[PDB]
Each structure stands twice: as C-alpha cells, then as structure tokens.
Amino acid sequence: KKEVRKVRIALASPEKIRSWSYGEVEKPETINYRTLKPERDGLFDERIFGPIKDTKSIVRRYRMGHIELATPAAHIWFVKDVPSKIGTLLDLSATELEQVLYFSKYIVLDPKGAILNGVPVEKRQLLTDEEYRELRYGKQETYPLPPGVDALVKDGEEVVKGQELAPGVVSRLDGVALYRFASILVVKARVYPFEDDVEVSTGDRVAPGDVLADGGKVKSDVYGRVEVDLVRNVVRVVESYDIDARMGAEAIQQLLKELDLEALEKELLEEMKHPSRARRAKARKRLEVVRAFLDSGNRPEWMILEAVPVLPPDLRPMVQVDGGRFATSDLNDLYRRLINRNNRLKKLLAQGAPEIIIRNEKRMLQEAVDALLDNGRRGAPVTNPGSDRPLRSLTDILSGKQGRFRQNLLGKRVDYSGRSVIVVGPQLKLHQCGLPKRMALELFKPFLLKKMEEKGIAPNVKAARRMLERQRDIKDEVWDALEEVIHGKVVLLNRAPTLHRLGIQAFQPVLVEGQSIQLHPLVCEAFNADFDGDQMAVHVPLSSFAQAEARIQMLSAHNLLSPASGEPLAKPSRDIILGLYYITQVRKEKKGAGLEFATPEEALAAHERGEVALNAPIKVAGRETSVGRLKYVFANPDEALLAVAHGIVDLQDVVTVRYMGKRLETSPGRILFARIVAEAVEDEKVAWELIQLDVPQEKNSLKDLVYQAFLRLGMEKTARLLDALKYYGFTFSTTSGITIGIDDAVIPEEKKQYLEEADRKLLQIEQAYEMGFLTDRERYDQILQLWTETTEKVTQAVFKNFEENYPFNPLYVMAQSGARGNPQQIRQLCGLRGLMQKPSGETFEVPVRSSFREGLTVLEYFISSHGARKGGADTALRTADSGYLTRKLVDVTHEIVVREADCGTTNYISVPLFQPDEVTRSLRLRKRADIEAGLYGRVLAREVEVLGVRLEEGRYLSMDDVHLLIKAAEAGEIQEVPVRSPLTCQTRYGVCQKCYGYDLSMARPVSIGEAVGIVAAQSIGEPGTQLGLPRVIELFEARRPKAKAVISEIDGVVRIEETEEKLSVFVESEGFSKEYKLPKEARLLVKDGDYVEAGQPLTRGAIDPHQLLEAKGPEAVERYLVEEIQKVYRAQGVKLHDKHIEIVVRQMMKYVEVTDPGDSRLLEGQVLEKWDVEALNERLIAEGKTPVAWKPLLMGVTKSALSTKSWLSAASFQNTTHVLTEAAIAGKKDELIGLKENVILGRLIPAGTGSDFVRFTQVVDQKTLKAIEEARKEAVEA
Ligand SMILES: [Mg+2]
Ligand SMILES: [Zn+2]
C-alpha cells in the first residue's frame, strides 16, 4: 500500500538465499520431449516453482529455486571487475594471482612461514602447491634395493655427495639415508637416539626447546614432525611442521572469515595518513570498499556465494516453435550444465577422491559457475557444437544494448498504433485531424464493439466481431456507431524524428473517405513535415485519465507558442501570408499632371474632369490626396465592400471610408482585413487597437498580431482568429491569382553596366597583378571583395527596380512578404549567383555570371555540383549528430522538475543591458532579440524604478516590461537587471517557480510539477539539426579548446613587450608579476598600459572553462558558458531563451570536491547539495566546527551524467556490471528521484501529473459534499 520511495540493493547471505528459495533443484531434467510436463526436480519442476496450470503462473515468475553447492563459489563480478573487489579487499593480484588461486592450483596461507627454503618467513606470500606439499612432508628421496640382500647401509647412516652408496649409486645432497630391509631413504632431517620414555609420540610436530623424550635429556631443536621407531628406539624429526592448506573459494572464504573490517580500517587509516600520495591513492581506493562493507551491514563473508539462486522458469522458458522443437533461453542450458557438473561433483565426493581428478572437476565446476553468471570473460562457452553462437547469460540479459534496462526505456512496440501518408486538411479547424475511415474503424475496434453492443446491432461481442470481420457486411448503422464512439475522443499524431515536444500533438479525429491522414496546414512547421509523401503515425490512448491529459495539455489548439521562446508556432504559413499581403497592399502608378491639390478647391472638379480623361489615374499620386479619395466616400465598410463587389473599385484602391468613429483613407482590402480580425474575435475596439492597418500584412506583422491576441484574449479566441485568418488567406490567394512565369523573373538592365565596371576593374587588378604589386593572397582577397561588393550592389539595384517598376511581381511579393524565398534566392533566379565555393573550402576566382532566368554553361553547372554535394553530405551527417547531442543533454538534465515552495534565495544574476564589447571598448544596448531572450519571462530579483514606474520585486517581466526596460536603457538609466535564475536556485532537485520564470507554451507563470529539464534539452537540441555544431559539442562537453586564448588570473596592469621571438605580456601587481608568452600566430587584443582583471582574455580565441573557473569563479564561467552557447545559436538565426542553457549549466556544476576532510575522506567529489546539508549539520545542526572546504568541479556533460547518486540511471546508461557492483558493495538506497529511474520502475513519473504536489487531490460534488458534511456535523455529538 505504502508508496515505494527507496530501493535498497545489497549482498546476500547464504541464510538469505535459503530463506528466499523454496526447495532445491538437483536433477538436470527440465522437461522430456515425451513427457511435456516437468520431468523431475530439474529446472522446470512443478512442485518447486508453483503449478503450471491455472495461484497463477506468476509464482513460476516469482518463486525461485536454489542449488546447495557442496563447494563454495565466488561471484564473477567481484573477482573480475577492473578493481578486483577481493583483489582490493585482500592483498592479492587480480590479473594472475587471484585467478590462478581461484581456478588453478596455488597456495595462500597466512599463519606461519618461518620455515626456510632459502627464503625468509612467510606472512601472506604465495607458493605453488608443488613446493607446498614438498615442504609439507620434509625431504623425500627413495632408491629401491633388491630383495634378499642386507646392504652395507644400516637404518641410521649419514650420506654425503660422492659417497658410493653401492658399487654404482651416489646421492645428491648431504643428509641421512635410512635403510629398509627395501630401499635407501635420503632425507634432510635430524635423528635422535634415546633410552627412556617418549614425550613426543609419532605424528606430533615440534618446535625447538620442547622436550622430545627421556625428559630433559632430549629436547627438540628444529621445526618438524616426529616419528618414533621402537625397532631402533630412535626419533626421526623431519623438517615439516603443521602448516595450513586451503584451495579455492573456501580459502577465500577463510580469508574473508579471518579478515576483520574494523582493524583493517584502522590500519588503512594509518597507511594512508603517514606516507605520501602514491600509496594513499590506492589506500583510499580500497578504503572506500572497506567503509562500504563496514557501514552497509553485509559482511564480505557471503560476498562469495554458497547457495546459488535459480531463476523462475517463466523468465527462461523453453517454448515450442514448430514440430516439437523448443526455442530456449540459454539460461536453461547453462543451468542444466551447472546442475550436471554439481551432480558429478556430488557423486565424485561420495564415492572416492582421486586428488588430481578432484582438482580437475573443482576447476570444471568453478568455470561452469563462471559461465552461468556471465559468458565470455573466461573462454567462450557456446551451444551444442556446430552452432558457434555464444550462449546468453544473466549479464547478457541485464546489460547490453537490448537488455532489461535498455528495453523498457524505449518500448519499441505499441498495440493501438498506425501510420499513413499525410495530406493537407484545409477544410478542418486547428483542433482537428482527418482520419481515414478504415483505420479509424479498426483503431477503435473494442470501442466499436462495446458501443454497437449498447444498441441492438449485434447480440454479443462475438457476433459483432464476426459481422465486422468482413467489409461486405458494413452498414450505415455501423458508421453512425463509429461517429458516436469518437465524438469526444482524441488521438496523438507523431512524426518519426521527434526533435522536440511538439512532435507529438493531440487532435480530434474527423471521419474522412480516402487513404491518407488529413492534417491542418498550420502545424506543417510544428512537425517538420512537408507533403512530399513522408508518413506520420497515430496512437490512441485508452484510459479516460489519459484522454483528459491529451485533450487538456497536448491538444494542439492549446499549444500555440514555442517552449524554446515566446514565438508562436501556429503562425500563418506561406500561402496565407501571400494571400493577406495581396489583399492588404496598396499600389501606386503615376502622376503626369499637376499633383498640387491642397491649394485649389476647383482642383476637386478639375481633377475629376482630368480623371474623366487620362490626365490622372484613379489612384493618382496627388499632393495631399488621390482623386480616388475624393471621388468615392463610403458611409460604412459594408458600402465599400459592396461597391467592390460591383467591380467599381478594387480591394487595393485607396478611398475615404467612415469607420466607427473616423474617416480613414484606406483600401477596402485593409478594411476587410480589420473586419476579419474583428469578426474572429468578439469585440472590435480591442481588435482595432491590436492591429496595424496602415501597412502591408507581412509575416512579422502576422506573428505580432497573433502574439498580441494570445496575450490579450487567451486560448480560444486566438485559435478562432487563426482559423478565420487562414481561411480568408486561402480564399483570397486563390481568387487573387498569383502565378509564376518565365517573364516574372525580370532582369534589371542597369546591373549590366555594373558588370562592365566590375569587368573593367578586374583588368586593372589583373594589370596590378601583372606589374607584381600584388601577391596571390592579397589579389584573391581583392577579387573576393570586389565580387561580393558588386553582388550586393546588383541586389540593391534589383530591389530598387522591383520597388519602382513592378510592385506586384510574384517573386517580389513573396520576397517582401514572408511567404517564400530570400534575396539571395531571388538574386540567383534573376541576377547572378556569382561566388561558388571550391571543394577545398575556398571560392572560385571565376564567378557565375548567368542566372536561372538565362542558361548556365555546362562548366558552371558542373562547378555548382560541388556545393550541392557538400550541402547534401553535411545535412546527412548533422542530422544524426544533433540527435546524439539531444540524447546527451536529456541524459544529463533529466532530474530537473519544478517542485517547490519559493526558495529563500537572497541571490540573483545581473543580466546586462549593454554589450560589454561590441567594439574594443564601448557599450551599446544588446540587440532586441538578445535582451528578449535574456529577460522575457524572468522574475525581478529586487524592486527597480527606472522611468517613474515601480517594478516591484517578484514581478514577472512580461513583454511590455522588457520593451520599457529597453527604452529606459536607450535613455540611459540602468545597464543591468537583477533577476532570479535557475543558476542560483536553492531547490534540492529542480528549480523553484520564482527562480525558473514565466515562459511556457502559455505566458502565465510556470505550474509546479513539470519537467523543465527535458524540454530544456529538447529546445537546445532541436535547432542543432538545421545548424558551428562542434563548438556546441566542445562547450557542453567541457573540453580544452585547441585555439586556447591566454587570459589573466590576477588584477593588475598590462605590460606588453614586443619580443619578436614571443610577445611577453606582464600582468603587473604590487607584489608580483605574471608573465605570458604569445607565439607569432597568437594575435592578442590588449594594449600596453591597460588595466587588466582576472579572467580578462589577453589574446583572441576560446577560453578553457576549467582554468577560467580556477581563476574567477563559478558565476563568471557560468555566464561565459551561457553567452558562448547563445552566440552560435544567434549566428544561425535561431531564437532560444536562456532558461534552458542556465538549467543545463547548473546541472553541469552541481559537483564539488572537498579539500579539508570532515567525517569522510578528502579527495572525493560529488553533489554540492550533499556538502550543503553536511556543513549545515557539522557546523550548526550538530556540534563540531570542522569546515568541509570544497572547491567546485566543472566537468563535461558526459562525466556529470555518469557520476550520479542514483544507480538505476547509471546502470541503464553505460555499463550495468561495474555500476551494479559498486551499488552492491554498499547498500544503496536509491531514492526514486529523477525521471529515468521511474521510467524503469514503470511507476508514476515524478514530473507532470505524477508530482506528489498534485498526485492525489480529493474531488467531490456539492450535493455529496452536503451529505458527507451532515454526516460530519452529526459525528460531532451533542
Ligand atoms: Mg518530407
Ligand atoms: Zn529558487
């Protein structure tokens, strides 16, 4: 019942394994082919895993078995991890020593080693088993003797080298040769005769000084075993004492049993505090392991495993494919192999012990356990021979690109989904999408079944399915049921590359006849989907709760503004823009008569007579008014438009119309546009005030109109305005007749002489190059400058020509309006595409004189093919590169969610209003877009009054406030604005509403509980696809730029010495001077004698963020990073707000490394807030003034993503093995904070609706409220 908050991962005791499992499996018989039921106690046995029939089969998913190995085993992760957990807990070498002990046959033994073989005492040294059992039993040399011969050697003869033991036998070392009847026994032992009782009997191993026999007469002199022979009444003392011997895991277990963590910890402390850093680094590397083992409970004794758990059968099922053959998970094969090996070991130990065979089968079992735990690390165990496909192990199931972690994180398949090609849906409103009738019928199939079961169409659901199974039985009643089903439902449309949040959009389906999905044209840019045939997909959420989600916050009618900025995305598109520009344009032709009209009053009649003739046009360029203004005057807009309907005057003709209160000299087109705006909305005074009816409706004007309407009216009215505006734009674009012919690409004639002049100039330049006054580089620069100047001159001439001569040219009308094209494209069409770049990256000397209006020569087309190929390849790579960048960003910033009470942050950031450096030393107000992206939607840190207006502290900066601040800065009152920011928020995991701000899909302040981190990452990454990018990569991944710029770290004065070898700049201070050397290519930007501060760039180039943080501090480098990121984004024309960059930069520098240790080690770095809390506890909450002096560490996006307190995300991110091992050494209570973890958990995501702030909210109607409240007051008795 209680909510899961922490997941603790830890190690298992053998008792824990026994309690966990329900019985033991000991046959290698999963299931026989004949008996499809579980055969015997094997891997699928019935009574041990739960019944296979109908508790459910989920016990066979939950209940697990176990194997009680007679021989202990150690987990492969703790022996093969890069830091060998046993190899770092113990003093053992991982690469060979640990494996050779744990698989092969060597000896490890602590207690005693003073026995000498030319080598001093042993404390923890390794000796091979061979010399071990040599030293175990003294010195053995044997030489047989023929029977029936009493040789010259007696039972106690001493023998040295060179002595003839026989006529042909010679020994090898000095010692004693014992005689048997029947051999000679050479030993390096000591014999001792005696004549009294024995104190040490046969078998005992004795130390010097201990009594051997005969009381004090005879005492021991060396270590070794004692053998008493009563035939000669003598003691032989071999040199072999009682010495410990263990093999394999039990030995390790012995080690782990004999190792105590507390004394180990103290001696590690001593071994790290005393010497230099060289040993203490690895001392900490193993001391963290020791502290984790000690502080987390679980002792390392069971860190090697005795009872192996057995996976429930349904997690590894053998399921039939065809013809009796069973497809199996390799886990079953590995378990069968392990069971067979264990049973072989069991019966082997039961029957007899051939020692070499026992060692061999111990190695066999250990390798089998290794393979079971994971395959590939030691050899490549494979399936039955002939199929060289490596078996799949537990690590393979968990880890890998397609594993348990990496397959729930995507969920590549969904049930209620479809896809189709999309077509324009202009007849639909913005909150609708056209759905083909067949996919609409099949998608809601259960809904259809239930709804037509509500009526009498079919008796039951089975009859319904059988009737609908064929389309020959369709009826119009079925279609009525269909339209009944989806009256209120919505579906989610999805584009395959989902670069941002708007790639998923809810819609209301409308039944249509056809194959394709009809899409509203206005969302043609929300999706990056054209109509060249590319497809788009549809999903259908089932639960009414999810329907509420989609209809409320994912419905497209409600998301009209970007999350990346305040700009709208539902702005009128190309066609509507062209139509409305055509309807609200005013022409102008000619005045060949006396234009003076203000003076003469007979000029009204005189020029009316002139207009009767051809003296002056109806739209004449009169001094004060056109004769059209005089001739026609309209009481109402209706009269003007009705007179237009009678063809008297066009929609583009100026005329005096008496509007609601004034006489306006406008065209009926502009009046009609104002009428459309006023009809789409309810009130007209507001509509009249929020439009600009004296200029053509260019795309910027439409965008401003839409934004203002959104601000002042809200959601529904803006949507209706967009619908009506699009509809009228379409109709007037149709009836107006905009068309493109070959003659529309008019060629201005004046440019011709321009070319000649350019040509002439080339000649002198060529002559200037012929005389040798110019070098190749400067000549190329001169030619490039001349051509790029004359191209601009020709473009200016082209636009002047289009203005003067043909106001209504289709190319010119779409250039002026925001429909399509750029001046460069129009110049290519009509003028000349002069400069064409070379494959090397430079530009050809010979330009392209021709245009597409004329014909290109073969060579010119062949040359332009180079640039075509370059652009194609660039796009084809940058697509995937930008996707990968977005992946990095979302991984690092997925923890940021606005859950908050307003944090008491007495801190802020001062957003500049003047560019610190637009020239070398000058201040100018930042570009309006820049100030908007820095200030719009922020919160004022403290009250400011600039122009007689009191902007109180805590007031969100709306668009009007930003404009007012910009105007004030223009006047010159303030230069910086103090604002709250995420960079200074004190919220633990996320930001507060005040520190975050005000920009959203809406304008209102952000709701508490939305993952602003994910949308931040998406807004950063989406423009990257159409974007340079290496700079962005090297900035979010904190790296060392190759073009490093020399900077200062201390304030002082600049002393530039012009040493020709290397320019030496001296930062001079009172007590010290710093010197920097600049090579020939290092072009500085400072002047001698200038005052210089910390972090001031001495040379031109990029700045390493790490050294900048070292010099100035966190805030300075944060501002530098944000500005540098914004630089490239502005350079590409993409408008992006700074909230997202600030969020990622804050997540980038949430790590500090302490320097003065407190209650833990010093040279360790992790989350800053942890020392925030810990310093609060150490200094204030608890006693003990130990300052945990930390330094902020700046690491790239990747490293910050990797090092996380939670281990779920780390396991799902890079490598499950090492991460899980680390999280297993210490019981890691993973808090379910962060979003990726709760995705893996599949539970309610913390962000959005799943925020505990809104997760539960009792709701009750009013009448039941009165009932329950009456029960309440009657519950209060008396
Ligand atoms: Mg396409
Ligand atoms: Zn805050």
Curated annotation (Swiss-Prot):
GO molecular function, one term: DNA binding
Cofactor binding note of this UniProt entry: Binds 1 Mg(2+) ion per subunit. Binds 2 Zn(2+) ions per subunit.
Enzyme class, first EC level, given as a word: transferase
Signal peptide: none
Residues reported to bind Mg(2+): D530, D532, D534
Residues that coordinate or bind Zn(2+) 2: C903, C985, C992, C995
GO CC aspect terms: DNA-directed RNA polymerase complex
EC number from the UniProt entry: 2.7.7.6
Keyword vocabulary terms for this entry: DNA-directed RNA polymerase, Magnesium, Metal-binding, Nucleotidyltransferase, Transcription, Transferase, Zinc
Catalyzed reactions per annotation: RNA(n) + a ribonucleoside 5'-triphosphate = RNA(n+1) + diphosphate
One example of a Gene Ontology biological process annotation: DNA-templated transcription
Pfam families named among the record's database cross-references: RNA_pol_Rpb1_1 (PF04997), RNA_pol_Rpb1_2 (PF00623), RNA_pol_Rpb1_3 (PF04983), RNA_pol_Rpb1_4 (PF05000), RNA_pol_Rpb1_5 (PF04998), RPOC_hybrid (PF21668)
Cofactor(s) needed for function: Mg(2+); Zn(2+)
InterPro entries per UniProt: DNA-dir_RpoC_beta_prime, DNA-dir_RpoC_beta_prime_bact, RNA_pol_asu, RNA_pol_N, RNA_pol_Rpb1_1, RNA_pol_Rpb1_3, RNA_pol_Rpb1_3_sf, RNA_pol_Rpb1_4
Summary of the function given for this chain in its UniProt record: DNA-dependent RNA polymerase catalyzes the transcription of DNA into RNA using the four ribonucleoside triphosphates as substrates.
Family under the similarity heading: Belongs to the RNA polymerase beta' chain family.
HAMAP family assigned to the protein according to its UniProt record, in alphabetical order: RNApol_bact_RpoC
Subunit structure: The RNAP catalytic core consists of 2 alpha, 1 beta, 1 beta' and 1 omega subunit. When a sigma factor is associated with the core the holoenzyme is formed, which can initiate transcription.
Name of the protein in question: DNA-directed RNA polymerase subunit beta'
Source species: Thermus thermophilus (strain ATCC 27634 / DSM 579 / HB8)
